[PDB]
Structure formats: C-alpha cells, structure tokens
Amino acid sequence: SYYCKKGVILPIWEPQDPSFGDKIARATVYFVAMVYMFLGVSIIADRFMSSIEVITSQEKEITIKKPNGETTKTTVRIWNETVSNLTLMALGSSAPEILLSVIEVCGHNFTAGDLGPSTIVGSAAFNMFIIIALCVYVVPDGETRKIKHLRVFFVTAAWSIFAYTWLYIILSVISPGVVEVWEGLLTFFFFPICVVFAWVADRRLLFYKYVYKRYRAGKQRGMIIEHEGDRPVSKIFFEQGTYQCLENCGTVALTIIRRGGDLTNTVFVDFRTEDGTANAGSDYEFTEGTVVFKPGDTQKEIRVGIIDDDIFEEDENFLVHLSNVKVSSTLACLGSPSTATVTIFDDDHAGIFTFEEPVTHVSESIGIMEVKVLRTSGARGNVIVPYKTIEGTARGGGEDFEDTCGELEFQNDEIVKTISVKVIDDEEYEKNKTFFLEIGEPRLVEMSEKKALLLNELGGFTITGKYLFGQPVFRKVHAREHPILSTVITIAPLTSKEEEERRIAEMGRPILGEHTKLEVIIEESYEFKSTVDKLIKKTNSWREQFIEAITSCFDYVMHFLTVFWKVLFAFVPPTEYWNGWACFIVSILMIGLLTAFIGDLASHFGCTIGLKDSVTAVVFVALGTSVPDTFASKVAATQDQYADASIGNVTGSNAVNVFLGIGVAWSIAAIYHAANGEQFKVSPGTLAFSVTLFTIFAFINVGVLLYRRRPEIGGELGGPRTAKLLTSCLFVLLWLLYIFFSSLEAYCHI
Ligand SMILES: CCCCCCCC(=O)OC[C@H](COP(=O)(O)O[C@@H]1[C@H](O)[C@H](O)[C@@H](OP(=O)(O)O)[C@H](OP(=O)(O)O)[C@H]1O)OC(=O)CCCCCCC
Ligand SMILES: [Ca+2]
Ligand SMILES: [Ca+2]
Ligand SMILES: [Ca+2]
Ligand SMILES: [Ca+2]
Ligand SMILES: [Ca+2]
C-alpha cells in the first residue's frame, strides 16, 4: 500500500502520496540511508565476531627468546575451529537477522509482519547459493578443497533444510494459519538440540580419531587459529674342491668333471661320503652312489642331502671320496683333487636384539610413535623381550607420555618388531623433556624336543600342533598362564662329547646387543614454532584503537567513506577487557539498535515506492544482513587445508536463523496472544511458496556439491577453471531464479 505504519524509531513522512516525482526524492534518501546503514552492521558484526572469538579461546604463555639474556613474556591465544565454536561464530555472524525478527515482532504490537520471516528465508537462499558460489571461486587455481567429514555435512545439511520444511509444516500442514505456543516453543527448543548435537559431535570426533593440527595467524593482533590438517689319459676330478652351503638349503650340489682322453668312452666312478666334523646320519644324509660317464659327456652333477634341525652348531665339514674308476668296453685315471670337503654353516642363532639408535629426537605432534627393535645375527626360535618405559626429565602419568610395560614376542624368522609409545601433545612453544625406554633380558620359549634336551630346560612344556623341520614344537608355559596340568609334559655320566655339544648349543640362546636403553628427547612441535616465528616476523588500548580508527587513493576513499562508523565503533571497549565480555555486551546492543533502524527503513522504502515487504526483504535486506557471513566463509575456504568450516558456517547460519529468530519471535507472539485470549495469526500463502522453492533448489545445490566428490573433479571446492566457472554460474542462476519467482508470486502473478 501507500500508507506507512509508524516505525519503531522513525516516524512517518507527514505528506502521504505527494506526487510521482517526490516519491523519488524520498525513496532515494531512504535507500541511500539503508545502504550506508548496512556498513555499520558490516563493521560492528566483525567486531562482535572478534569478541566471540576471544570469549571461547584458550590462553597461552610464550617465553620469547632473543639475543638479549632476558626472555620476554608474551600472551597468545589459540581459538580452535570446532563444530561448537563454529555454531557460536555462525550465531554471532547471524545475530542481525535474529535481532531484526525479534524487533519486528515486538515493535508492531506483537503482530507478525512479512519482513521478519521473509528476510530470514531470503538470507537462507542467499547463504546457500551465492556464498557457496563465492567460496567455489575464491579457492586459488591449481588447488582444491574437500570436506574431510562428509557425514557431518550430511547431518547438518539435513538439519538445515529440515528447519525450513518444519516452518512450512507449522504454517500450513499442522494447525494451518496460526502459530500456537507448542509450535513456537518447540521450534525454539530445536536449537539446544543442535548445540548439544554439536558438543557431542566435537567430543566424539576429537577422541575417536587423532587429528593433525596446523596453526595459522588469526584475524586479531594476538590470536592463533588452529585447524585440522593433513600430515693324456682321461682324468676325473672335482670342479671346485670346496663348497659352501647353508644348513637349510636341503641339498648341496657337487660337480664332477671328466677332462682329457677321448669323449667317446664309458667309465664308472663311485662316490661315497665320509665322516668329518659333521656326523653321518645326523647332519648330512649318508649318500653312497655310483655314476657312469656316457660318451661325449664331460660333467656330471651329484647331490648330497643336508639335514636341517633347530640346534645351534658351529661350522662343520664332511668329506666325499671318489673311487673304483673302471673302463667299459690305465685308460682312466683319477684326478689329483679326488676328495671334496663340503662345509655346512649352521644358522640357528636365536638372535641379537638392539635398538636402532641410542637417541631419537621427537615432537609431541607424532602422537603414537613406533620404535623398531632389530633382531640380527639369527632368526630361529620364538623369543620374548620384556620392555618398559622409564621416566626421566619428562614425568609420565599420562600427562606427557603413557606408561607402557609389555613383553614383545618375536616369532620364527621375524626380524623387526615395533614398540608403540603414546606422547601427549602439550603444544608448548619450546621444551626439551626426555624419557628412557629399556628392554630387558630375553628368553627363548618354543623349541624342538632335542634342543630342549640339549639346553636342559626343566619347566613345563605344552605341545603345540605346529610342525617345524619335521619335529613338534613345544612351548614353555608361563606361570601366569593356567593350563589343564594334564597337557603339560616335563622333558627334563655324560660322554664328554655331549657336554661339548651342549656347550655349543648353549651359545644359541638370545642375548642383548649394543643398544639396550633408548633416550627419547621430546622437542617442541614444528607447526606451533613456525607459526609463532612467522607471527613475530610479521608482527593504552583505548588510545591505540582511537588513533587506528583515524588514519592507494582507493584506500583513502574507502577510509573517508567509513570514517564515521570507524570513529563511532572505536567507542566499543577493546576485546582485552573483561576477558572479551566487555566488547560482547556492548557490541550486541550496537547491533540491535542499529538493526532496528534497518527495519524502519525497510518498512518505509517499501511503502514510498509501493514495494511489498516480502520483495524488499528478499532482495535488499537479506543481502545487507548476510554480508558478515560471507567474509567468514570466504576466509575459511581460502585458508583451511580442508574446506569443512566454510560450508559448515553457511549451514549453521541457515539453521540458526530459523531456530533462533523465528523461534523466539513467534514463540513470544504466540505466548502473548494465547495468554491474552486471541489466537495468533500468520498468513502462510506467500511464505509457503518461497520455502518450498528454497527446499527444491537446496536439494539441487547439495546434489551438485556432492557431484564434485569424484576424483576427476578433485574436490568439493575449487579445482579446474571450467568446473569453477560452471558451478558458480549455476549457483548464481539458481539464486536469480529463486528471487525472480518469489517476487513474481508475491505480486500474485504466480
Ligand atoms: C540424525 C542422527 C545422526 C546420528 C549419527 C551422527 C553422525 C555424526 O554426525 O557423526 C559425527 C562423526 C563425523 O565423522 P565422519 O564420518 O563425517 O568423518 C569420517 C571419519 O571421522 C574420519 O574423518 C575419516 O577417517 P580417518 O579417521 O581419516 O581414517 C573418514 O573418512 P575420509 O572420508 O576422511 O577418508 C571420514 O569420512 O562420526 C561419524 O559420522 C561416524 C558415525 C558412525 C555411525 C554411523 C551410523 C549411525
Ligand atoms: Ca499450526
Ligand atoms: Ca652336527
Ligand atoms: Ca647341522
Ligand atoms: Ca637350521
Ligand atoms: Ca643346525
């Protein structure tokens, strides 16, 4: 219409419908005042967001070292991006729309206007489309961003869309045309469910999975934001005369060469093995054979079996004798190296256990660390190595490292085993705390029966089904373990040759190596050190704020253009006072009153031109009051390793807008009206179409965002220039279509 109801603050222009031309003279003043008024919100909401950053920040103390002997004391704070803190920043960034809704309801005798809910729905569509398109385009070329937690995005996106479809439910589906107390109070109570869900999610996400932390410089002077980030007779003789074969080869391949004379001859030669150091039948199979040289053949290959057992022995040798050379159908004479001496190298040492290095320097960012324990010089048997951690300078009670005391078990032919130690991340700027880790005397456990007799073990033996080298593997039973006591079997004038065998076999038990005590020196985290060094390199309070308020030509124009708001908001107390709360109380009022002014302007620029409140809520006020959100979303998209916070801010703001603003405003109106005895009325016809259109387009937006999860695209946000431009153009087109159709239906064109 063309009659204007009185504002909360501003009174009506006394001439009404004056002329076709005078409407311009009033409307340009109203619109210019609104546009210049939005800058005040854009600045004071930034300061309010800074204050609410200060409120939820952990304090840290830094002892800065410099070439002077004295070390300076500096305080830096560490605001951590978490789902709970992003919701508070989103609510803080989303405060103007909530205060606009509350003031719009309360000012006009508790009667709902179009402006309040309509600017919330318009800001919802703006937040979902235009800000996400901007976040798509601001990621630099050659870089992409991916949502680390897709399931968090799902739950949050579903909750965000569910808020608006619930708005449609209470306006049209359930109890149409009215808003009862049980509807508005429930819609308000939905928000604590969201914040408890955020708190539960933050605790579960941090505890369940360790997150690598990266520190970047904050917006303020002394804040360090931390975020999760990514981390010529014929002669017969041996070819060699000396052979070297391991015990576990199974067969040693001897070779016999016939040379000279004539190839076309038939001769017989008999090879038999003879006892040397290695005994026949126990270490080498007694192989006696006869071979014949076919005519035209020079070499003949023979094999001798090597018996493998688990007992440690020294190097041994056995001989091979050739004899009885005969000529079939003198002519054949034996070569000079007739006899061969085969040597067996036993390799049944149980091991030598060493730490890799005597000292390692580590930071707390490693979290769980692995320390190798090398087992050299042998592999046979199964060996337990006890290990423990000793507190040095670093006191250990789970505050600096977890006390681990265990027993490593080295299986057969297992060389490297890892000790897992937990280091608590204190994220201190500089510390040099040390703790030791020591391995005790190792004991062999499982063995064959013959080795058990040779080592003269007396303990209880449980027979295991595993077969090694054709013999059963018995295991010594620890006193803690409780067998049936019927399964266990005790194996339990020596010839003075068997004593020597026992002495040689006794050298096979596991021993310790050179390094038994590893000193781990905990050094400072590299990310925090680099961040603080960069911050120092890049580098009372009332006075400083005032002179910084009053300070290339484009910068001069912008500064002069906003000098009124900067001077006025320099009267806001600095964020150091009252732990930040001094700003928090004073800034929000400076929003509220200011926000009230916007409403009156939006109530009058509509009536002067003849523009409905729904349209001027959708296109003008929604764009003006959502500009504090887009800066946070853009910075979070640009700086983060993973762009979870950028989309999360949009989604949290879109949920918080409804659940706070429409919640408290409509609940207060419903309580007042129901107590007074008159039912509270809201016409759902205009808002129902807009909320349905927003839901339909939000599903498309979510689908298009999920389409970029393919490895061809690269990530959720950014990537190749073509995909960036296509996605941004699609989102801007979607927002344009939304506002065009909503504005057309508001004028009943449909
Ligand atoms: C509306 C009610 C909702 C109730 C459920 C509420 C669900 C909810 O909000 O959970 C928050 C949290 C989010 O974690 P989310 O799963 O989003 O993140 C995954 C995980 O936490 C790690 O970040 C990644 O593994 P890793 O550590 O890097 O190896 C993993 O793989 P990648 O993609 O990064 O490679 C990530 O996808 O936990 C769950 O979702 C697990 C639910 C398990 C049960 C799910 C079924 C209930
Ligand atoms: Ca209802
Ligand atoms: Ca032997
Ligand atoms: Ca042997
Ligand atoms: Ca062997
Ligand atoms: Ca052996």
Numbering used by the authors: 17 to 247, 370 to 467, 482 to 644, 652 to 698, 707 to 718, 737 to 935
Anything the authors wrote about it?
We therefore determined the EM structure of NCX1 in complex with PIP2 diC8 at 3.5 Å, which indeed adopts an inward-facing conformation with intact inactivation assembly. The density of the IP3 head group from the bound PIP2 diC8 is well defined in the local-refined EM map focused on the TM domain. The lipid is attached to the cytosolic sides of TMs 4 and 5 with its head group positioned at the C-terminal end of TM5. Four positively charged residues, including K164 and R167 from the N-terminus of TM4 and R220 and K225 from the C-terminus of TM5, are positioned in the vicinity of the PIP2 head group and likely participate in the electrostatic interactions with the head group. Two major conformational changes occur in NCX1 upon PIP2 diC8 binding. The first change occurs at the C-terminus of TM5, which ends at R220 and is connected to the two-stranded XIP β-sheet (β3 and β4) via a six-residue loop in the apo structure. When PIP2 binds, the TM5 helix extends by one helical turn. This loop-to-helix transition significantly changes the locations of these connecting loop residues and their side-chain orientations to accommodate PIP2, enabling K225 to reorient and interact with the IP3 head group. The second conformational change is the partial detachment of the CBD2 domain from XIP upon PIP2 binding, resulting in a downward swing of cytosolic CBD domains (CBD1 and CBD2) as a rigid body. Thus, the PIP2-induced TM5 movement, particularly the reorientation of Y226, abolishes some local interactions between CBD2 and XIP and also pushes CBD2 away from XIP, causing the partial detachment of CBD2.
Na+/Ca2+ exchangers (NCXs) transport Ca2+ across the plasma membrane in exchange for Na+ and play a vital role in maintaining cellular Ca2+ homeostasis. NCXs facilitate the exchange of three Na+ for one Ca2+ in an electrogenic manner, primarily responsible for extruding Ca2+ from the cytoplasm. The eukaryotic NCX consists of a transmembrane (TM) domain with 10 TM helices and a large intracellular regulatory domain between TMs 5 and 6. We previously determined the human cardiac NCX1 structure in an inward-facing inactivated state in which XIP and the β-hairpin between TMs 1 and 2 form a TM-associated four-stranded β-hub and mediate a tight packing between the TM and cytosolic domains, resulting in the formation of a stable inactivation assembly that blocks the TM movement required for ion exchange function.
